[PDB]
Specification:
Rossmann fold, dimeric, binds erythose-4-phosphate, transferase, 3 domains, binds calcium ion, homodimer, 41% helix, 20 strands, six-stranded parallel β-sheet, binds thiamine diphosphate, transketolase, five-stranded parallel β-sheet, EC 2.2.1.1
């Protein structure tokens, strides 16, 4: 049959791609080709419009199996060809060794780090439910799409998937349909050596529906039926157990050796001959397969055409919601949304930047419907919920509704991070956020790094940023955390000092389209600064206090900017004139013009940095660095600052020593370099 | 009864401690006091010998509840007093806001970051099983202790606990007994908002035994019986469901408000009066409670005394094993163990540092019985198993035995990290290790940071360190990872260049008693260096190529040292004389004398760093930095190096530019500072 020929085509494209590269993973592609064929036949998608908002989404969580995904995309006529498959795993190709959403048409997210993709699927499904609840009306199913995820044993072992699966079950996400590749083989061999849990019983305990397909090497009828069954269960995510043979068809099927290395040439020949292909030929695409797949594309394109007419009719019947939806699909924020950002003066009261963040969210959430977010069980500590708003919950619970805007993530930082990536991946201009303590953003590093690589505009509301949190002590107090994330490409790490800087940080975070944000916020109160503004702070770094005859410039962030200003006054009594620079986001600053940056950090003057955590990175901006390179302490916060000499006098002492150290030396800006 | 009085005493000590600090968490201590009383009555321990190797261990995974732990330790006459309780959460006290094993007698591990403690308990239990299998003989139960863990809803939400619980069930760890504080309250309120899974069904799916105690606010008889029941189930870890009221007794019992803030003064008065205490008194310790607890201590001390005689008899009957055990309990490695470390010359073949690591392990595992370790499903990629050795598995599986030395962690990096901490915490000189790709050590950051804070000598065998891994691409290639961990206090981050440096890295890792190690190792082959030795590399940084008339010194690590040596030759053709420094561990280097360090990085010469990942930190050691501050690429590794100009010519170009940039300038060592 043509379906059998399609499955063989997929299998052999994947094996031939791995063969050409002499690198990659043929086993799971061989085992999952029947399921991929069946799923893609059920999916609604347009290869010529990868952003159709009502498409079904597919996520390959076992991203090492990407030769399978690329083969599907090629066969369906995405902007990916057999010539691209021939360049699998080659420098600069459109077929990298793990799927990259920035590079690969039809890759919704970036996978390869195990466990992430299923969580991303939870986020795509969460977004779809929220979106549908916001826009659908009687006779107007604007959003009714499904989220299909493939995953393997490795993903099921990674704790992040447990977090997301518990939450997805709680949230009754009935449009999520995941498929477990139950092949009992991982890199170390049989799953009997390390993974003997009853997976199905665990997924039932989360509130998932289960369908089991005992012969997923051949039984595409049962796979299709499992999808139909899953669609009938509207209040539970479904896990479909696909019992497969890893490397199905290979001489080495059912072994760890077929997981992650190219097949032998003779093995590939016998695959071809028993499936009716020419063993002398590679990258074969039978025209009957193309025809069958093209029929499904043409039908899907008619579905999208009808959706476009539905959307036009929606705009007539619901003019306000229709214009809102159009604006979001155009990727535009509301006109002048930023006029809602709070502005402060030096006459205003001291406020913790966590509370300033609450106030910003309170003002902008009503103005910008595409903002949703939550906290990892720290809502009253992070201050991440706007008063009055409704939680995102299934209405059946009585605790919220899917139209809600506030997500109770529970104590699940890593899954929160990966779910945020999925919400961003959904599209429709979602600007989504997640709160925890800064020190516990580190629990989610696997996902945060992928936010950066995937270019998703997600935001971490990361409170309790330093020893300023006080008594909870060194297990809670960041030291390395900002250095870690600043050292990651493409992360904006805002550490606002005051009200105006906090508004600038949110302006950046919400306007972002390609850069994740971490907002490092205080537990403790900070004063409003003389010289701050949204305008200046939007530059990432700016001159807060200009001193034309400066003996030293102090560059600082966050809570240490006020400290620097107080130190300036101590220094004045010692006959030393200081300027102050505030550097709320190093990435944004770095992106400014060379001349702007040199206006902030000029030649001819020593520069001291002050920030109460690691000194790593700070030599980009300073000659000397006053930081905290040891763990913290459990005590009242002001006492901890005093212990470590983060006081006006302690800063002044180090500033005076810096001036003395450079006496008789020629000093050029830290921004200068040899290459 | 005295038991009722003891429970009230515990409850009121905890509440009074929180009250004195005006900070901390009274709710879980109130709810868990009956269970704590019951468990500690069953436990064997000596308050005057916290290191008795056959003690039962207790771990408070819900570490915010530490006022409870501190109250138990005080009541039992550990080196912690009521005066210390009065200083709860005060700077410098022995009663920090979360328990610290370095600071608190009787705190086995450091908790506070949720999820960690249960995993640490899995590691303590794993170590106990391995230790017992290694040493016990007929009539010689040298090791027969239990591991008791308290945990809450937060720990159960964190994915790391799922990983460890799946693995513990697989490993049939019957001496692990965990207690879930089933109080249905977290920081965001009811667990109904985010955590509605069937926890008990999930734990059954992992292969745990379950006991449910429906009235754990009062029923200490049932808690004691649950422990007895758990002890009879020798092939399954047990979860005891303790249904409690958070804040039991408080006016505000059963609410999130009692989780994490001090009680009102009037609430504390009514607690005291209804439990028969004086509402005008704080920190009361009824002498009858002290007497009852002292009886149990005296009995436990007689048990330890008998154990000491058993150990003496063991040494007579089993002289070799007895001497081995004594040496380990003394904290000493085998005499001259390091003579087993492989040594190389420049005439030897190029070898990847992952393979050099395999060879080291092959030589030292037979010589040092206290080395055990594993991989997170990357055994044939990390090369972490010595040929011939047996896996740590329950013998019932046929896949290993508890005397085994190699752990199949599965795809569970975070739990592996926390389990390693527990194995270290067990004691007996365990030197344990865990393999994964360097980029996925980041999945385990929560635990790695705790290795550093807890001062545990654990080792990560972190292969595939850079773009040198090639085709798996940017989702696998570290950029930020070394900067992150080097910026964390107390982490030795070895990046050995060759065979001799790899042996030095292991010498450091195995000799360590207070510093965790990460060994960043290559996929790709590297040459043996002219000038390397174990002796010199043991200094952390050393002069590889001395040049008395140097125009520049190039400092490099790992794969980039050979690159620097090749660049030296290119530079010689351009009329530029270079020296080369190898810096295999920045922490070890930093600990050397000022004069040694200045001999390596002298004044009067420009210094360029070269390392194919973030430049953060490198200004400690260099004037200019050549690094990789963007994500990688999917292609053949040599092509990626060429793309980013990590070639002899590219390094030479930047070295020449560095020399030119400093022409006419006075240059002092990067090691100099103003303060
Ligand atoms: C977070 C993370 N850890 C480790 C790896 C390395 N790795 C790649 S695939 C794999 C496991 C393979 O098992 P499974 O997911 O069952 O794939 P299959 O054997 O079915 O191909 C591992 C450990 C990774 N990609 N991501
Ligand atoms: C990794 C991590 N994330 C977040 C927190 C902040 N936090 C402290 S306690 C807690 C949850 C409280 O719930 P539970 O563990 O059930 O404690 P109980 O309410 O019973 O006191 C949270 C989210 C933390 N300590 N560690
Ligand atoms: O899963 C992917 C590969 O099998 C895995 O990353 C191992 O890579 P290696 O070929 O470097 O061992
Ligand atoms: O669990 C501990 C505390 O309740 C938690 O860390 C919140 O701290 P906060 O008092 O800063 O909100
Ligand atoms: Ca598998
Ligand atoms: Ca709880």
């Amino acid at each position: 049959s043509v379906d059998q020929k399609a499955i063989s085509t997929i299998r052999l494209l994947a094996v031939d791609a791995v063969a050409a590269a002499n690198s990659g993973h043929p086993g799971a592609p061989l085992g999952l080709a029947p399921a991929a064929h069946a799923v893609f036949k059920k999916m609604r998608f347009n290869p010529k419009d990868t952003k159709w908002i009502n498409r079904d989404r597919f996520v390959l969580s076992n991203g090492h199996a990407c030769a399978l995904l690329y083969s599907m995309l090629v066969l369906y006529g995405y902007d990916l060809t057999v010539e691209d498959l021939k360049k699998f795993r080659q420098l600069g190709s459109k077929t990298p060794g793990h799927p990259e959403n920035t590079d690969v048409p039809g890759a919704e997210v970036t996978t390869g780090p195990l466990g992430q993709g299923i969580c991303n699927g939870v986020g795509i499904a969460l977004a779809q439910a929220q979106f549908a609840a916001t826009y659908n009306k009687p006779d107007f199913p604007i959003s009714d799409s499904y989220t299909y995820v493939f995953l393997g044993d490795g993903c099921l072992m990674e704790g992040v998937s447990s977090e997301a699966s518990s939450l997805a079950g709680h949230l009754q996400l009935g449009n999520l349909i995941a498929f477990w590749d139950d092949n009992k083989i991982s890199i170390d061999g049989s799953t009997e050596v390390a993974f003997t849990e009853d997976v199905i019983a665990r997924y039932k305990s989360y509130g998932w529906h289960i369908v089991e397909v005992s012969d997923a090497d051949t039984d595409i009828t049962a796979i299709a039926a499992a999808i139909d069954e899953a669609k009938k269960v509207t209040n539970k995510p479904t896990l479909v157990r696909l019992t497969t043979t890893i490397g199905f068809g290979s001489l080495a099927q059912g072994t760890h050796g077929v997981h992650g290395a190219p097949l032998k040439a003779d093995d590939i020949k016998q695959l071809k001959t028993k499936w009716g292909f020419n063993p002398e030929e590679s990258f074969a695409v039978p025209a009957e397969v193309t025809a069958s797949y093209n029929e499904h594309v043409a039908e899907n394109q008619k579905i999208q055409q009808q959706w476009n007419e539905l959307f036009a009719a929606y705009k007539q019947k619901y003019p306000e919601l229709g214009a809102e939806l159009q604006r979001r699909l155009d990727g535009k924020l509301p006109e002048n949304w930023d006029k809602a950002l709070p502005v402060y003066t030096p006459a205003d009261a001291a406020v913790a930047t966590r509370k300033l963040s609450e106030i910003v969210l309170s003002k902008i959430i009503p103005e910008v419907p595409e903002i949703i977010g939550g906290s990892a069980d720290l809502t009253p500590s992070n201050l991440t919920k706007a008063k009055g708003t409704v939680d995102f919950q299934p209405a059946a619970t009585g605790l919220g509704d899917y139209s809600g805007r506030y997500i109770r993530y529970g104590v699940r930082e890593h899954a929160m991070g990966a779910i945020m990536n999925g919400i961003a991946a959904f599209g429709a201009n979602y600007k989504n956020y997640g709160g925890t303590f800064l020190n516990f953003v580190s629990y989610a590093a696997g996902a945060v790094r992928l936010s950066a690589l995937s270019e998703f505009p997600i935001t971490w509301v990361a409170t309790h940023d330093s020893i300023g949190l006080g008594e909870d002590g060194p297990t809670h107090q960041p030291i390395e955390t900002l250095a870690h994330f600043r050292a990651t490409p493409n992360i904006s790490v805002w550490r606002p000092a005051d009200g105006n800087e906090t508004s600038a940080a949110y302006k950046s975070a919400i306007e972002s389209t390609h850069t994740p944000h971490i907002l490092a916020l205080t537990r403790q109160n900070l004063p409003q600064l003389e010289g701050s503004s949204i305008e200046k702070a939007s530059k990432g770094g700016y001159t807060l206090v200009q001193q034309d005859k400066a003996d030293i410039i102090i560059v600082a962030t966050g809570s240490e900017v006020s400290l620097a200003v107080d130190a300036l006054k101590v220094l004045e009594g010692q006959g030393i004139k200081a300027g102050v620079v505030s550097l709320p986001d190093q990435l944004t600053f770095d992106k400014q013009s060379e001349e702007y940056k040199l206006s902030v950090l000029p030649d001819g003057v020593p520069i001291l940095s002050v920030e109460v955590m690691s000194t790593f990175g700070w030599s980009k901006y300073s000659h000397q660095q006053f930081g905290l390179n040891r763990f913290g302490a459990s005590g009242k916060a002001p006492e901890i600052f005093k212990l470590f000499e983060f006081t006006p006098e302690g800063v002044a002492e180090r500033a005076a020593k810096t001036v003395a150290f450079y006496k008789g030396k020629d000093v050029v800006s830290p921004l200068r370099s040899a290459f």
